[PDB]
Design an enzyme around this catalytic site. Structure first.
Site, PDB file in Angstrom:
ATOM      1  N   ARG A   1       1.583  -1.426  -0.295  1.00  0.00           N
ATOM      2  CA  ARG A   1      -0.141   0.061   0.027  1.00  0.00           C
ATOM      3  C   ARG A   1       1.148   1.007   0.391  1.00  0.00           C
ATOM      4  NH1 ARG A   1      -4.147   1.269   2.857  1.00  0.00           N
ATOM      5  NH2 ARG A   1      -5.929   1.017   1.295  1.00  0.00           N
TER       6      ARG A   1
ATOM      7  N   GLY B   1       2.788   3.053   1.450  1.00  0.00           N
ATOM      8  CA  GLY B   1       4.892   2.912   2.695  1.00  0.00           C
ATOM      9  C   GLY B   1       5.344   2.714   1.045  1.00  0.00           C
TER      10      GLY B   1
ATOM     11  N   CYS C   1      -4.769   6.891  15.388  1.00  0.00           N
ATOM     12  CA  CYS C   1      -6.079   7.240  14.741  1.00  0.00           C
ATOM     13  C   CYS C   1      -6.867   8.249  15.273  1.00  0.00           C
ATOM     14  CB  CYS C   1      -6.274   6.803  13.186  1.00  0.00           C
ATOM     15  SG  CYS C   1      -6.238   7.491  11.340  1.00  0.00           S
TER      16      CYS C   1
ATOM     17  N   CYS D   1      -3.838  17.365  12.477  1.00  0.00           N
ATOM     18  CA  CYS D   1      -4.276  16.728  12.116  1.00  0.00           C
ATOM     19  C   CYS D   1      -5.968  17.853  12.111  1.00  0.00           C
ATOM     20  CB  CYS D   1      -5.433  15.333  13.111  1.00  0.00           C
ATOM     21  SG  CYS D   1      -4.803  14.069  12.265  1.00  0.00           S
TER      22      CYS D   1
HETATM   23  C1  LIG Z   1      -8.707   3.506   9.092  1.00  0.00           C
HETATM   24  C2  LIG Z   1      -8.518   4.661   8.916  1.00  0.00           C
HETATM   25  C3  LIG Z   1      -6.946   5.266   8.455  1.00  0.00           C
HETATM   26  C4  LIG Z   1      -6.769   6.709   7.988  1.00  0.00           C
HETATM   27  C5  LIG Z   1      -7.904   7.070   7.748  1.00  0.00           C
HETATM   28  C6  LIG Z   1      -8.650   7.713   8.549  1.00  0.00           C
HETATM   29  C7  LIG Z   1      -9.290   5.908   8.759  1.00  0.00           C
HETATM   30  C8  LIG Z   1     -11.048   5.297   8.937  1.00  0.00           C
HETATM   31  N1  LIG Z   1      -8.011   8.801   7.490  1.00  0.00           N
HETATM   32  C9  LIG Z   1      -6.331   8.771   6.861  1.00  0.00           C
HETATM   33  C10 LIG Z   1      -6.549  10.684   6.789  1.00  0.00           C
HETATM   34  O1  LIG Z   1      -7.611  11.413   6.756  1.00  0.00           O
HETATM   35  N2  LIG Z   1      -5.835  10.904   6.411  1.00  0.00           N
HETATM   36  C11 LIG Z   1      -4.414  10.060   5.634  1.00  0.00           C
HETATM   37  O2  LIG Z   1      -3.752  10.427   5.465  1.00  0.00           O
HETATM   38  N3  LIG Z   1      -4.627   8.364   6.613  1.00  0.00           N
HETATM   39  C12 LIG Z   1      -5.271   7.909   6.930  1.00  0.00           C
HETATM   40  N4  LIG Z   1      -5.670   7.141   7.715  1.00  0.00           N
HETATM   41  C13 LIG Z   1      -4.335   6.531   7.462  1.00  0.00           C
HETATM   42  C14 LIG Z   1      -4.395   5.377   6.550  1.00  0.00           C
HETATM   43  O3  LIG Z   1      -4.651   4.117   6.465  1.00  0.00           O
HETATM   44  C15 LIG Z   1      -2.490   4.644   7.198  1.00  0.00           C
HETATM   45  O4  LIG Z   1      -1.884   5.834   7.959  1.00  0.00           O
HETATM   46  C16 LIG Z   1      -1.895   3.586   6.221  1.00  0.00           C
HETATM   47  O5  LIG Z   1      -2.392   2.975   4.912  1.00  0.00           O
HETATM   48  C17 LIG Z   1      -0.326   3.596   5.712  1.00  0.00           C
HETATM   49  O6  LIG Z   1      -0.154   2.615   4.820  1.00  0.00           O
HETATM   50  P1  LIG Z   1       1.297   1.358   5.317  1.00  0.00           P
HETATM   51  O7  LIG Z   1       1.766   1.616   4.102  1.00  0.00           O
HETATM   52  O8  LIG Z   1       2.301   2.111   6.470  1.00  0.00           O
HETATM   53  O9  LIG Z   1       0.308   0.649   5.972  1.00  0.00           O
HETATM   54  P2  LIG Z   1      -0.813   0.260   5.701  1.00  0.00           P
HETATM   55  O10 LIG Z   1      -1.524   0.423   4.749  1.00  0.00           O
HETATM   56  O11 LIG Z   1      -1.575  -1.248   6.074  1.00  0.00           O
HETATM   57  O12 LIG Z   1      -0.436  -1.033   4.250  1.00  0.00           O
HETATM   58  C18 LIG Z   1      -0.046  -2.060   4.835  1.00  0.00           C
HETATM   59  C19 LIG Z   1       0.345  -3.229   4.086  1.00  0.00           C
HETATM   60  O13 LIG Z   1       0.863  -4.491   3.998  1.00  0.00           O
HETATM   61  C20 LIG Z   1       0.379  -5.361   3.498  1.00  0.00           C
HETATM   62  N5  LIG Z   1       0.726  -6.390   5.118  1.00  0.00           N
HETATM   63  C21 LIG Z   1       0.540  -6.884   5.803  1.00  0.00           C
HETATM   64  N6  LIG Z   1       1.287  -7.663   7.058  1.00  0.00           N
HETATM   65  C22 LIG Z   1       2.080  -8.419   5.781  1.00  0.00           C
HETATM   66  C23 LIG Z   1       2.397  -9.669   6.488  1.00  0.00           C
HETATM   67  N7  LIG Z   1       2.879 -10.258   7.212  1.00  0.00           N
HETATM   68  N8  LIG Z   1       3.493  -9.833   5.558  1.00  0.00           N
HETATM   69  C24 LIG Z   1       3.606  -9.227   4.286  1.00  0.00           C
HETATM   70  N9  LIG Z   1       2.511  -7.929   3.825  1.00  0.00           N
HETATM   71  C25 LIG Z   1       1.882  -7.734   5.017  1.00  0.00           C
HETATM   72  C26 LIG Z   1      -0.597  -5.598   3.726  1.00  0.00           C
HETATM   73  O14 LIG Z   1      -1.384  -6.584   3.378  1.00  0.00           O
HETATM   74  C27 LIG Z   1      -0.862  -3.578   2.684  1.00  0.00           C
HETATM   75  O15 LIG Z   1      -0.990  -4.507   2.068  1.00  0.00           O
END
Ligand SMILES: *Cc1cc2c(cc1C)nc1c(=O)[nH]c(=O)nc-1n2C[C@H](O)[C@H](O)[C@H](O)COP(=O)(O)OP(=O)(O)OC[C@H]1O[C@@H](n2cnc3c(N)ncnc32)[C@H](O)[C@@H]1O
Ligand SMILES: *Cc1cc2c(cc1C)nc1c(=O)[nH]c(=O)nc-1n2C[C@H](O)[C@H](O)[C@H](O)COP(=O)(O)OP(=O)(O)OC[C@H]1O[C@@H](n2cnc3c(N)ncnc32)[C@H](O)[C@@H]1O
Lengths: 356, 356
Positions: free
Chosen positions: A9, A11, A177, A349
């Site tokens: 995603r 990052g 958050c 924020c």
């Molecule tokens: C929940 C939420 C978040 C949010 C928001 C409102 C809500 C209800 N509003 C936001 C806003 O107004 N402005 C903003 O900039 N951010 C906002 N957020 C936050 C956003 O959700 C997070 O800050 C962002 O998603 C963080 O991104 P990152 O890329 O760091 O993390 P992630 O999205 O969880 O992606 C995780 C990826 O890693 C994969 N993954 C996880 N575990 C594993 C393992 N074990 N092995 C392999 N891959 C893994 C996930 O599948 C995903 O692809």
């Protein structure tokens, strides 16, 4: 040079694409993600009277990535051995693998500890679960009246070791958050006001700590006044422990009436990182780094987005920011002179401002 | 029904246009402004290397207003007699007019007390003066090196009587518009970084109080850390008193090195309002009202935008917001059932977030 990018995603993708575009053939960029597809919907839904706006972007990493010279392998990281520079992961078929890297960019984010909430399975409505926010939409329209509780679970922030960044660049937060909670509270008031149900529905907002802690005391008092005006209750220092059918309970035995519980689950470190080289991660399960996104312990490990210790609040745009920095710093290392953007903390924020 | 609207910017125009569109012939809407034209440029300039982006909207109230069924009279309000419902003003020809109203909407804003700053005429560079932004632009591009001081003058906020609004809806601020100071500080660093002059130019930011007071201590400390990193000095509780050629002095006789002084002048009430019915205004020269924009003393006087006591910080969008409310509330009074929008305080200035 083999560069592994963990996750799919904000990052991960930012770092992978930025890196490949910057170094091209000077390195092999491979992404390992627990799933083949990455979905990007909207932060908060659009609770509208008879108007359901769908708008999801679905990426197929297997096709999208190669198309940019980035290899892709689907698998679930189980741990990172920073000492031996190995990434251990389980493949879809159940098989186990481990790949060596010269550099690794950790973008696997954090964890939504729904498991820490008794009754979650049975009565929970999450704001961060994909087609779980659909369950809510349907529930909200059929709602005849009653109590609604909205808030977030505590943030199990790590504190040691500390990131190697300037003073005050990382805030201490009880919630990871929280801004979305304020927005949704106001939206839910609107939705029910338009349905002339304000007298039938009673909204209570709950915070694990003080509520919108980046604000001054007066600004926090102002927010409370708005809630008072709108007939919304506010309960601070309520660290949710259980969800029953008609109420939620905190760690001290206090309750809030709730027929519908809208919860932003507690934030904990990614288990895969908790099970990684002990001195790669902090007590929370997050990777402390310097302003270049480089681990303070292993100079060939980069942490971006939610997985990085300094990203508080846990924001998508900080994920993108850190993703770029990581990629630019690495490109320089790989002999491609590149400007490395400076990292700034958020300060506030913008969702704290109702005029947003 | 004769409704007088005083002023020609955000608050005035919003109220006039909104009112006329809402009641049409049910009322005569006339606007009195100290000038025939109203200009709408950009909040802060775009200090770019060899790229000057002009983008100003120029309204001719005499033609634009009547085109919408709104009369226009140019004149400078000298005082408002709330008791007799008379508005005293000077016409262009020098004559002194006195008109009566059934209702009045005060949108003449506040005052930039540059006069309270010794040496302003001689060495001041304002951020809120139309083509003053020009004198600055030219000065900044010819700058060979030295010291720059940027900040705002104290806000002479009024406190009594108090607005009839919910608790904590009006903040106490030492500065009326401080966010622009933070933005400009960062922009000036960029401009000089691009010229490779960071070592030749030394920026000091000054605050009449504790800077960015809508923020938590931890967010304020973060901001200070950013300044430190960027080599920007910060001096709090510095209430400017004089501007010399090479330094700015505060009341106490204390100095800050400054070859270029960028100042947001001190905010005081509009003199015309200070000279109006004593119990119409507060000790600051602002008109306290209720959430409907109606004076707490005279039910036929509406105050909008900067001229209203509750608008802190002093923001254009709050001016637009209050302008609408005033117009909708009045329309109802004139027998045109209309929904009156709810007024919210800002909570935080989004400019506090550097990612903005
Ligand atoms: C929940 C939420 C978040 C949010 C928001 C409102 C809500 C209800 N509003 C936001 C806003 O107004 N402005 C903003 O900039 N951010 C906002 N957020 C936050 C956003 O959700 C997070 O800050 C962002 O998603 C963080 O991104 P990152 O890329 O760091 O993390 P992630 O999205 O969880 O992606 C995780 C990826 O890693 C994969 N993954 C996880 N575990 C594993 C393992 N074990 N092995 C392999 N891959 C893994 C996930 O599948 C995903 O692809
Ligand atoms: C200075 C500044 C302001 C600012 C900003 C950045 C800077 C450097 N950034 C802003 C932002 O990012 N967002 C936002 O919403 N606002 C921002 N602002 C604030 C904005 O300038 C003010 O809040 C806004 O202008 C307030 O509007 P209002 O309509 O209330 O007041 P005004 O603009 O001063 O208009 C005054 C009108 O009244 C007329 N006038 C004044 N005295 C008289 C008399 N005696 N008689 C008749 N007419 C009078 C003026 O001519 C003007 O038309």
């Amino acid at each position: 040079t083999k560069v592994l990018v963990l996750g799919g995603r904000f990052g991960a993708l930012t770092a992978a694409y930025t890196l490949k575009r910057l170094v091209g053939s000077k390195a092999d960029v491979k992404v390992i993600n627990k799933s083949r597809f990455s979905y990007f919907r909207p932060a908060l839904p659009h609770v509208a009277i008879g108007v359901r706006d769908v708008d999801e972007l679905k990426v197929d990493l297997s096709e999208a990535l190669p198309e940019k010279g980035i290899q892709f392998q689907e698998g679930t990281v189980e741990k990172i051995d920073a000492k031996s520079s190995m990434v251990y992961y389980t493949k879809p078929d159940g098989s186990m693998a481990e790949e060596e890297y010269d550099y690794v960019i950790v973008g696997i984010g954090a964890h939504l500890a729904t498991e820490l909430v008794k009754g979650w399975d049975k009565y929970g409505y999450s704001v961060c679960e994909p087609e779980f926010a659909t369950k809510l939409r349907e529930k909200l329209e059929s709602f005849q009246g009653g109590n609604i509780a909205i808030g977030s679970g505590p943030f199990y922030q790590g504190h040691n070791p500390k990131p190697k960044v300037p003073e005050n660049f990382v805030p201490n937060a009880d919630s990871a958050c929280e801004g979305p909670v304020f927005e949704m509270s106001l939206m839910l008031h609107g939705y029910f006001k338009k349905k002339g149900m304000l007298d039938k529905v009673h909204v209570t907002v709950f915070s694990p700590g003080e509520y919108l802690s980046d604000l001054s005391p007066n600004s926090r008092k102002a927010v409370a006044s708005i809630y008072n005006q709108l007939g919304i209750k506010l309960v601070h220092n309520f660290k949710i422990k259980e969800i029953r059918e008609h109420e939620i309970v905190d760690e001290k035995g206090n309750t809030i009436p709730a027929d519908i519980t809208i919860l932003l689950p507690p934030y904990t470190g990614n288990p895969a990182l908790k099970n990684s080289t002990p001195d790669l991660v902090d007590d929370g399960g997050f990777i402390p780094t310097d302003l270049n996104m480089v681990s303070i312990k292993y100079d060939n490990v980069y942490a971006v987005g939610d997985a990085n210790s300094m990203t508080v609040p846990k924001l998508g745009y900080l994920a993108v920011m850190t993703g770029r920095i990581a990629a630019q710093h690495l490109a320089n290392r790989l002999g491609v002179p590149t400007k490395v953007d400076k990292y700034y903390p958020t300060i506030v924020c913008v969702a704290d401002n109702p005029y947003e």
